[PDB]
User: Which sequence fits this backbone?
């Protein structure tokens, strides 16, 4: 099960065409939908006269099944060269990307990822040849804490998925929330990706015990959120109502299927993306008859239309079928075009006067990759930072349930600073108050009390007063916090006093 | 392959350990004396005599 096309210079791809489901079921939105985008980009590049004249590109596309070990064991085909691979364009999960980068760096094959958002990959000591078209998962935590503090939420529960992405994201979120101030994690939970009442139902039944925390921040995978929602619906319509999800939830309508009322009013974040109209025409025209290139495509059809009853030779992929372009279909084109531009610059420099091609050096090719900027194929300039990342711009969506239909609509933005519109928002309950106790203020000389780390008494500190010298009410009207021993005036019998 | 008996050079041992740790194969070098391999964060399955 693979796609092999031959050309002067060819590239590799890694996509999660199969998912665990509820390699069990095809990933309609983040599988086939991205293979077709990569093939469309390759076809568009080949016909362009300006770029790679006399060089025809090819593809080596494989399946990861959303597993790091499986992708690692099938990425050995890239190094054993069989077909020689100039660069690898496919990586969709941080766990897959890290393991693939570890093997590829040894054999000096450049890699570009279109959907992996993990700060660990920002390290260039251990990942020399890794490049990225999306921002690292460090601005996303800042955006989530900004959303949490803007609406006054200080008592929240956090859930994460075991792995690089979930753990790194939840650690960054906790650090930024502590730095922001007043955001306190009542419960922090982790999920191991095994759907079982032992863990997932226990997570939902352990979030129940803290009723004051009515908001949940989650760093969980695409498949883990589905089990979270299913367990939430089973267990008395959930006890963790508000869900502030990261890009893994994104705006995917598939996970919330049959569990819609659970996610009513949730707020989710995605990378800022603009639709590509050119790919819309390409995808719809891909019939079962004509699209023989994709080996998996037939199976996708059986899932998409629930057909084999005999199929009617009139069904198509259109607005009725909810074509619904995936969010990260613009970064695949950017990655493929960046690699093509780097190869074009390399071959223009090395052998002037000959458009055609012998041996490619990974190090200098990667040096070319880090030093190329260009306007996007149709939407926006593409460039790499010093570490190979992309700038952080995020959009905010909310799972509103209109009477007619349930959908995500944009509710704001975040580029180093947060814009939001509360008026159009709709809530599950009525803002979801998530607080424990009133914050301490220098009201009658300040205080700070122990208890549950999320709770504080904030009583008075009776007596004298000073300006900023309040250290747990420490003495030098004593105030129990006397620091007026510094600025104290000495009074003596004045000359002009009447007693004098 | 239960285990791999090392290498006689530090560069060879490092390059072999990098590939072997991914597939979880223990390694025991008999003649590599570099102190870069003393790190256990990047060389999990490497040991030396
Ligand atoms: N950024 C996510 C995946 C994003 C996606 O697949 O949509 C991760 O690191 O796993
Ligand atoms: N310890 C030496 C090798 C000594 C030997 O092989 O005799 C090295 O790291 O290269």
Assistant:
């Amino acid at each position: 099960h693979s796609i092999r096309v031959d050309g002067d210079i060819i590239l590799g791809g890694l996509f999660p065409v199969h998912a665990k489901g509820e390699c069990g079921e095809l990933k309609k939105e983040k599988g086939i939908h991205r293979l077709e985008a990569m093939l469309y980009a390759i076809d568009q590049i080949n016909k362009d006269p300006d770029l790679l004249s006399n060089i025809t590109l090819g593809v080596r596309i494989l399946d990861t099944c959303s597993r790091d070990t499986y992708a690692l064991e099938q990425s050995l085909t890239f190094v054993q060269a069989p077909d020689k691979i100039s660069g690898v364009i496919g990586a969709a999960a941080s766990s897959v990307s890290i393991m693939v980068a570890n093997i590829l760096r040894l054999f000096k094959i450049p890699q570009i990822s279109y959907a992996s958002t993990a700060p660990e990959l920002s390290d260039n000591t251990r990942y020399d040849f890794f490049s990225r078209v999306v921002p690292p998962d460090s601005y996303q935590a800042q955006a989530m804490v900004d959303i949490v503090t803007a609406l006054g939420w200080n008592y929240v529960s956090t859930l994460a998925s075991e792995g690089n992405y979930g753990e790194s994201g939840v650690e960054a979120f906790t650090q930024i929330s502590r730095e922001i101030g007043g955001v306190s994690i009542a419960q922090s939970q982790k999920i191991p990706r095994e759907p079982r009442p032992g863990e997932f139902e226990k997570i939902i039944k352990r979030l129940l015990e803290t009723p004051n925390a009515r908001a949940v921040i989650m760093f969980a995978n695409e498949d883990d959120i589905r089990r979270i929602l299913e367990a939430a619906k089973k267990l008395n319509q959930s006890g963790h109502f508000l869900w502030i999800g990261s890009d893994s939830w994104g705006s995917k309508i598939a996970p919330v299927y049959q569990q819609e009322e659970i996610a009513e009013g949730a707020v989710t974040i995605l990378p800022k993306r603009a639709s590509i109209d050119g790919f819309d025409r390409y995808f719809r025209s891909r019939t079962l008859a004509n699209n023989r290139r994709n080996v998996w495509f037939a199976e996708f059809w059986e899932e998409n239309f629930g057909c084999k009853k005999k199929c009617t030779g009139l069904e198509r992929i259109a607005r009725d079928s909810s074509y619904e372009q995936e969010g990260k279909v613009q970064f695949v084109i950017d990655a493929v075009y960046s690699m093509a531009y780097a190869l074009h610059n390399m071959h223009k420099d090395l052998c002037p006067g000959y458009i055609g091609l012998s041996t490619i050096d990974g190090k200098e090719l990667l040096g070319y990759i880090r030093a190329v900027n260009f306007n996007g194929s149709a939407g926006t300039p593409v460039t790499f930072n010093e570490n190979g990342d992309a700038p952080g711009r995020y959009d905010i969506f909310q799972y509103q349930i209109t009477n007619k239909s349930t959908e995500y609509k944009v509710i704001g933005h975040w580029t180093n600073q947060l814009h939001l519109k509360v008026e159009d928002m709709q809530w599950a309950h009525t803002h979801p108050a998530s607080v424990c106790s009133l914050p301490c203020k220098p009201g009658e000389r300040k205080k700070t009390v122990k208890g549950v780390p999320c709770c504080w008494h904030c009583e008075r500190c009776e007596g004298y007063n000073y300006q900023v010298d309040e250290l747990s009410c420490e003495l030098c009207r004593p105030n129990m916090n006397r620091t007026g021993c510094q600025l104290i005036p000495i009074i003596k019998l004045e000359w002009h006093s009447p007693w004098a």
Q: What stands out?
A: The first strand of chain B starts at residue 27 and ends at 29. Chain B touches chain A at residues 15, 18-19, 22, 42 (CB under 8 Å). The radius of gyration of chain B is 9 Å. Residues 39 and 46 of chain B are 9 Å apart (CA to CA).
